[PDB]
């Protein structure tokens, strides 16, 4: 009934995430995104993928 | 004789001070002219993005679309994979990616 | 450098050293050798001096 499913997702997601997702931190500027300490730089290869 | 112009994809928000001097179209300076310690450093200079650029020692590479080991520009303009082999015309940026 | 008064929490100084390591060129090596010189990680060829 779309309520118990949301509750189940909430109690799953309460401990599903141990860290910061890599697709949320868009607050980076170009100088930090380009910088080699970025762990997402090695996954940005094709402009449409 | 008309000269061809090869186009390389690159992000919009690009520091324009790079192109005001003698720059490199790959976005990251490469070549064998930088040595001193070992022998397996050519792939490290040209393709290893864990460490910074050799020339501009503040950032990894200018564009991440034509500088990685298998990026779009490297897949499209390198001679090792040979995607443009059957074309009779010249790609003038072949010498910078191989 | 070592010798100063350390922070009370080790995770605080670990996160602080990790963040300071990002966005910089010369950094201590990650094994952190006790009885070491703490030499920064050597790189590939140098460009202009």
Residue among C44, C46, C48 with most chain B CBs within 10 A, to mutate: C44
The CA-CA-CA angle for residues B8, A26, A28, to 5°, reads 80
B47 to A34, B61, B70, C33: CA distances (angstroms): 14, 10, 9, 29
Determination technique for this PDB entry?
cryo-EM
Task: Tell me the C-alpha distance between B41 and C44, whole Å.
Answer: 6
Report yes or no: B93 and B25 within 8 Å, Cβ to Cβ.
yes
Structural tokens at position B57:
């020692």
Question: What is the DSSP track for C31-49?
Answer: T--SSS--PBPP-S--S--
Q: Within 10 Å of residue B68's Cβ, how many Cβ atoms?
A: 25
- List B residues 52-71 in contact with C (Cβ-Cβ < 8 A): 52, 54-55, 57-58
Tally B–C CB contacts below 8 A.
29
């Amino acid at each position: 009934t779309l309520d118990v499913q949301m509750g189940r997702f909430m109690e799953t997601w309460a401990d599903m995430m141990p860290h910061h997702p890599h697709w949320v931190n868009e607050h980076l500027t170009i100088l930090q995104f380009i910088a080699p300490s970025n762990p997402r730089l090695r996954f940005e290869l094709n402009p449409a993928f | 004789q008309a000269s061809v112009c090869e186009f390389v994809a690159m992000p919009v928000s690009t520091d324009l001070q790079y192109f005001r001097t003698a720059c490199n179209p790959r976005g990251r300076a490469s070549g064998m002219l930088y040595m001193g310690d070992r022998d397996a450093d050519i792939e490290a200079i040209m393709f290893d993005h864990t460490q910074s650029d050799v020339a501009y020692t503040d950032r990894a590479t200018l564009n991440p679309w034509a500088s990685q080991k298998h990026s779009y520009g490297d897949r499209l303009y390198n001679g090792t994979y040979n995607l443009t082999g059957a074309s009779p015309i010249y790609s003038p940026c072949f010498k910078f990616f191989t | 450098s070592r010798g100063g008064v350390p922070m009370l929490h080790d995770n605080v100084t670990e996160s602080l050293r990790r963040i300071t390591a990002s966005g910089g060129r010369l950094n201590p090596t990650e094994p952190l050798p006790i009885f070491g010189g703490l030499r920064p990680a050597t790189s590939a060829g140098i460009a202009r001096g």
